Amino acid sequence: DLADRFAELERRYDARLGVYVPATGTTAAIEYRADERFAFCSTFKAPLVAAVLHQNPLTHLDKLITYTSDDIRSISPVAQQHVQTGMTIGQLCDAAIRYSDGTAANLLLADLGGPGGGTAAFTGYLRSLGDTVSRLDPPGDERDTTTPHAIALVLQQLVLGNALPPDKRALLTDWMARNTTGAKRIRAGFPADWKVIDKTGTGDYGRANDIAVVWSPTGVPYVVAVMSDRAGGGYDAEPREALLAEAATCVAGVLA
Numbered sequence: 001d002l003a004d005r006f007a008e009l010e011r012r013y014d015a016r017l018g019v020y021v022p023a024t025g026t027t028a029a030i031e032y033r034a035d036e037r038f039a040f041c042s043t044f045k046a047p048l049v050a051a052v053l054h055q056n057p058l059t060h061l062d063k064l065i066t067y068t069s070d071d072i073r074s075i076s077p078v079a080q081q082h083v084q085t086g087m088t089i090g091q092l093c094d095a096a097i098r099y100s101d102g103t104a105a106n107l108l109l110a111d112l113g114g115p116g117g118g119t120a121a122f123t124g125y126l127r128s129l130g131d132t133v134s135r136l137d138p139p140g141d142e143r144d145t146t147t148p149h150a151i152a153l154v155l156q157q158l159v160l161g162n163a164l165p166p167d168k169r170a171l172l173t174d175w176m177a178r179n180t181t182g183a184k185r186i187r188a189g190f191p192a193d194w195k196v197i198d199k200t201g202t203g204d205y206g207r208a209n210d211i212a213v214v215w216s217p218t219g220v221p222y223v224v225a226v227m228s229d230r231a232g233g234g235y236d237a238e239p240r241e242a243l244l245a246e247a248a249t250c251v252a253g254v255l256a
């Protein structure tokens with residue numbers, strides 16, 4: 001049984017784990033806590049970049065955005081070394097996905113505009129793709145959570161579907177392919193000849209997420225959503241990337 005392995009991982013890492021791989025032609029859904037809520041964390045940044053991409057002509061990626069000292073409130077490795085010059089929407093997009101740049105995310109939200117610095121327009125974007133589950137706005141807390149199941153179906157639609165026109169779908173896909181942050185999660189649990197694109201998230205209460213699209217060596221695709229937290233260790237509990245790698249390995253197994 002596959003759920004025994006997963007429960008084993010949860011015991012080992014003293015974690016709660018969430019896994020969802022949506023069904024295909026010959027494969028059934030892989031699901032484990034696939035319907036419980038977990039924080040979004042940085043993972044929202046991927047569909048956030050789709051939101052922006054969808055919303056505008058491609059040449060909008062060339063609009064220059066200025067931001068100051070007070071705009072830099074979270075880990076922002078790219079927004080630090082630009083604050084002077086400014087940054088383009090495309091550069092912010094690049095930074096949001098590939099480096100999980102928090103300031104880049106907050107500026108891209110602000111670009112979407114509307115109430116709540118853009119989080120309503122954002123949620124609106126998710127409703128439009130049939131996601132009634134997620135919500136952007138404390139383990140368990142309703143706010144800024146999604147389910148392994150809801151996010152995986154969102155990513156499926158963005159990377160393998162008609163949510164974005166080929167050209168814009170491509171741009172999203174490329175940024176995730178060249179992610180710098182996911183080396184030790186889903187990537188690590190799949191053989192080197194499977195091609196894996198992903199966006200990660202990480203937070204307090206030992207939260208660690210990875211959402212990905214994978215392609216078998218013969219080009220068959222799957223969406224893989226892995227979400228976890230470790231409330232057992234309190235606010236300052238450490239994220240366990242291993243747990244994510246391991247789960248992926250167990251998922252790599254079934255799909256190989």
Ligand SMILES: *C(=O)[C@@H](NC(=O)c1c(OCC)ccc2ccccc12)[C@@H]1N[C@@H](C(=O)O)C(C)(C)S1
Pocket residue numbers: 041042043074075099100102181199200201202203204
């Ligand atoms: C999005 O998850 C980012 N995470 C954090 O900035 C973050 C955090 O955010 C609340 C404002 C709270 C606690 C921690 C603890 C340790 C690292 C980061 C945070 C960025 N994304 C992460 C990712 O895995 O994609 C990251 C690159 C480690 S920071």
